[PDB]
Amino acid sequence: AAVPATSESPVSVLCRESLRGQAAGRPLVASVSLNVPASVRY
Amino acid sequence: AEPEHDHRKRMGLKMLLMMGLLLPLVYAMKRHKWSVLKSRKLAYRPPK
Amino acid sequence: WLEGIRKWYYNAAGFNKLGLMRDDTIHENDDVKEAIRRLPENLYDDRVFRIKRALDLSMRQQILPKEQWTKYEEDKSYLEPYLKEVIRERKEREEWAKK
Amino acid sequence: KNLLRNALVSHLDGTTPVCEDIGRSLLTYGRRIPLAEWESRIAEVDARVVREVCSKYFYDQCPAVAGFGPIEQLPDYNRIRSGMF
Amino acid sequence: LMKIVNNAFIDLPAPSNISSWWNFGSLLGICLILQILTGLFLAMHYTSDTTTAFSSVTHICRDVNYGWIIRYMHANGASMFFICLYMHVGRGLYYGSYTFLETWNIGVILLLTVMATAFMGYVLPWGQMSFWGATVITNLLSAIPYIGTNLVEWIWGGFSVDKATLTRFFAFHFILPFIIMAIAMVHLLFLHETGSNNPTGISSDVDKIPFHPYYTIKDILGALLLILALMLLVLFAPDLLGDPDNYTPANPLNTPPHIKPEWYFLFAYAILRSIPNKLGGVLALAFSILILALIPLLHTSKQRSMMFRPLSQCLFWALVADLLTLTWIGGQPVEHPYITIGQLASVLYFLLILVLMPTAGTIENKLLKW
Amino acid sequence: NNAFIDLPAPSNISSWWNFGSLLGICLILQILTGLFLAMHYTSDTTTAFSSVTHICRDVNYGWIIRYMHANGASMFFICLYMHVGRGLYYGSYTFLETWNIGVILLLTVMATAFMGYVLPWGQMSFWGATVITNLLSAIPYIGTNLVEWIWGGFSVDKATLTRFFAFHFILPFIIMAIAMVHLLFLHETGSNNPTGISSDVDKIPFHPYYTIKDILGALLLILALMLLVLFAPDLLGDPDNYTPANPLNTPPHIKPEWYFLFAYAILRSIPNKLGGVLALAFSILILALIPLLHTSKQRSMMFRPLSQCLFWALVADLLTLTWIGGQPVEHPYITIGQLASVLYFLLILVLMPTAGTIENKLLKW
Amino acid sequence: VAPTLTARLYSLLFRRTSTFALTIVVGALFFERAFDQGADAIYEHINEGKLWKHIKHKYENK
Ligand code: HEM
Ligand code: HEM
Ligand code: HEM
Ligand code: HEM
Ligand SMILES: C/C=C(C)/C=C/C=C/[C@H](OC)[C@@H](C)[C@@H](OC)[C@@H](C)CCc1oc2c(O)c(OC)cc(OC)c2c(=O)c1C
Ligand SMILES: C/C=C(C)/C=C/C=C/[C@H](OC)[C@@H](C)[C@@H](OC)[C@@H](C)CCc1oc2c(O)c(OC)cc(OC)c2c(=O)c1C
Ligand SMILES: CCCCCCO[C@@H]1O[C@H](CO)[C@@H](O)[C@H](O)[C@H]1O
Ligand SMILES: CCCCCCO[C@@H]1O[C@H](CO)[C@@H](O)[C@H](O)[C@H]1O
Predict the structure, then answer these.
(1) What GO biological process terms does the UniProt entry carry, in alphabetical order (chain F)?
(2) What is the CB neighbour count within 10 angstroms for residue F138?
(3) Which CATH code is given to the segment(s) B4-48?
């Protein structure tokens, strides 16, 4: 819709801090939109 | 031998005046556009 | 005075005033183009910058401060080993082409 | 206008986005502008207003350009500048 | 419609550093258009019969509205054409542009065609220089063994220059410029395959800028300077580069005692005049122009341009000074000491190109250790 | 190559497709004979007619080059009319750019031939220059000024003859450049064919198939041209142009070159100056409207009986107008010409578009 | 709170393309009159008493 995704796709990490949060913790979810960048969580 | 004598000189006066005007103006237009390049600065930053 | 005239010539030639090294000024024929293609990243990138810097000075009809001129004694042939081999390879092929 | 209305209300969904809108708005506007006010501001925009405001900021104005990567084809600044009119 | 007008002009990549010496290509395009435009308008009032040719030209200058300005613009435009042609060729030799072989050789054809074209145009007013120029130049062909004389009479349409000659020359002069235009377009197409050379002789692919607006405005500035030079001649000294003898109608019984060629042919005329042999002079004349086709094969330097080559530069200016010497000699009587100065200048011309410059090239290579 | 040798072409184009190359040959022929005639022609009114007789009597083979040029102009028009007819019948006009450039080509060739006919300065030369340039006088407010400007005076005279030689000299080369553009647009689509159906599933290389067929066509063109030059060089010409121009007298049975007769009949049918000039201009410019008047669901007339009948009626009508143009302005020719003129515009603007719609209906689409 | 000449020339004449063109048309017709009159005056003054228009009165009456 009106809101663009946090990160627009196209086709990093060098420290512990930037690495924390990268490990997955829940099952995967894939989203596709008409107006918004796709996403995959977990 | 040259009936056009007086007319070419009158025209020549107009040509000189017009050139005195157009040459520096076009030159100013040339420098305006070219200023983008003449003052540009380069820097080389290779990885190392 | 040949070595004496050499340093004189080097400065008279003046590509050093634009910061170029002698090999940056060679006429590019197919042998040279192949040799440049064979250069390692750093030598290729440096060459590109020196040429770009020189073209820029040329456009402004300017030259570098004298302390930045390429020095005769420090100018070295970075291209020679590559070009010499490219030429050797072509000669070898040309020999083979005769029966 | 409809896209903007939807973005505004859908953004203020959850305590964090609302909290941030409070903190930043007091610093930027000196007050929290209520949705009803944003609506009035949006409602009054029409084609004439869009043309006039866009012309004011975009028309024949010098842009700032930034390029990075394989940009041999990024147009020359003069050409970019002429594209502004 | 867009493309090829665009990618062939608007976004054409060009070196960032080409100098004013690169302006002559567009100035030549402008000289060609000028000649074609003033030419067509003159042709609307010119008649090619020997009884009325000279007369029709005075009618143009005296009674056709602005006929005089169109005429002197055509006459002086031919001079501007050559000034630009020689600057253009000089630029090419100095900067090694001749390494673009196809572009260069087409250029040599262009030089010859413009010379032939200007020759025929000069014959049209049928004044004294017109008549004797037609006589002498067509006769160069008589040096061809076995058929030479036959070829001349065939060109003339008779046993001497006469009505048949003037009438066909009007036709040849009329069409050749358009052929030149087509040849020039080919000249440019080959150039576009490589793009332009630049003062350094070093590839400029790492620093190209779009032709528009940088060179479009620079070319316009150059065009203005060309027009100023042309109009200074047309409005203040229309006869300066001309010959008084052509204001005298053609007289087949008498060749003027101080007959001399148009100034842009003087260097070649000096060379031919220096050899006391018919065939020898004709060959030297032909070779003085055709040698341009040999320049590429005579290139010895490891560098393309003369910018970084001191010795080659000195020899280059000696060649220019020598052409200036030959131009001066071509305007002097065949008497002492001019006969000897001209022979030395003629020998020096071929020596600089065939021997001294290739040699300077090798010496410079040695001094740079490659 | 790829602009000739391996150019893809429909396997079924017929002889009607040979006229494009024949037009190219007519153009080259006119340019070659033209230049050689220009080597002996002088444009002063005191000597123009004389120089032409000098070409025909004393220049070696001057007579054959001259009659080849004169009859070549006639062959040029025969081919032009065949070429346009092919286009209308087969719907080739849907190639819009190619077609409109073609219309420009037709007008330029007409203007070119007009000016050449003035060069020998015979009676027809003079009155043709008078009448045709005067068409411009129909333009309001400035028309008369335009005519005097073209003439270089208050009447056709020396200034006119001299500039016409220059215009006639250069225009054919301009035509050649325009024709090259004509072909370039054509190459974007390739040729249409008798069926009007895309031939992409059955293309053959231009060489050797059409190169040899074009050569056979060229041979037939040369036969027709030489039958005229060697056996009847004056058949398609006008005796009055063997009489030097006389500004004080317009021949009583003056008539246009045969290839201009249909248009002349149309202009003559309207007893009003501006109206006649507008009808003349429109009789040619209407070609630019054909594409907009196409109502059929099918491109070619091959499968359209009603359209074919109206097409031949148009050709028969142009034949009628050609005949009328050669007759005096007397009864019943005046009325036959008016009907024929009206029928011409009626067939193109109304009857053909209508037949197209009816045919669609009959096919249920 | 006051602009300069160029800023005014910009706002009213150059900004809009329709107005930048009307400005040139108008300026061209005005310049032509002033330039021709001025240059003609300079030429005639440099050549005072030599031109037909200067001595014509002596012979006129026709
Ligand atoms: C009617 C004559 C000519 C026309 C119209 C013409 C036009 C041009 C144009 C428009 C260019 C590009 C701009 C420039 O670099 O100047 C060019 C380049 C060039 N021309 Fe010509 N030219 C003519 C004659 C000649 C002659 C007589 C020669 C040489 C014998 C020649 C040699 C060249 C070469 C080699 C280049 C490349 C220049 C470079 O990039 O360094 N031309 N010419
Ligand atoms: C490369 C282009 C051309 C060159 C170099 C050229 C050169 C010349 C020269 C040197 C003259 C003699 C001028 C004099 O009277 O002193 C001349 C005359 C003439 N040219 Fe051209 N010409 C060119 C193109 C044309 C074209 C395209 C036409 C006509 C379509 C033309 C028509 C004439 C005519 C009518 C004359 C005779 C009148 C006169 O002498 O001024 N020229 N030309
Ligand atoms: C100097 C005159 C002309 C020349 C040299 C010329 C040449 C050509 C050539 C070489 C072809 C391809 C062969 C063919 O299909 O016939 C062609 C096709 C065509 N021309 Fe012309 N043409 C000329 C005038 C015209 C005119 C006057 C028209 C119509 C107003 C026109 C309309 C077309 C069309 C529509 C095509 C495509 C034909 C198809 O594929 O069915 N041409 N022309
Ligand atoms: C589209 C091509 C051309 C057409 C349709 C054409 C047509 C004509 C026509 C109808 C005439 C009158 C012939 C007569 O009855 O005497 C004529 C005369 C002439 N044409 Fe052309 N022409 C063409 C191209 C040219 C060219 C390129 C030249 C010369 C460069 C030329 C030179 C002449 C000359 C000098 C005459 C006068 C002598 C004569 O009447 O035969 N024509 N032309
Ligand atoms: C039908 C067309 C024909 C036959 C064309 C032939 C063209 C030939 C050449 O062009 C390619 C030629 C013009 C060109 O040679 C390279 C010139 C540099 C030759 C220059 C030239 O001029 C002279 C000239 O102008 C004169 O005037 C009154 C008089 C002359 O001596 C008395 C001469 C003369 O002694 C020479 C060598
Ligand atoms: C400087 C160049 C100029 C002014 C060019 C003008 C070109 C105009 C048109 O071409 C595009 C024009 C030739 C074309 O109209 C479409 C023709 C079909 C017009 C045909 C035409 O011919 C006549 C003709 O030949 C005559 O000969 C003795 C006499 C004529 O009546 C007495 C006529 C005449 O009454 C008409 C209508
Ligand atoms: C740009 C200045 C170049 C020198 C102009 C001299 O020019 C020369 O003048 C002679 C008469 O004195 C003429 O006979 C000769 O044809 C002409 O080229
Ligand atoms: C190709 C078959 C053409 C028909 C032959 C008649 O041809 C006609 O003859 C008349 C006088 O006899 C001429 O005035 C007229 O211009 C000509 O087209």
Answers:
(1) mitochondrial electron transport, ubiquinol to cytochrome c; respiratory electron transport chain
(2) 18
(3) 1.20.5.100
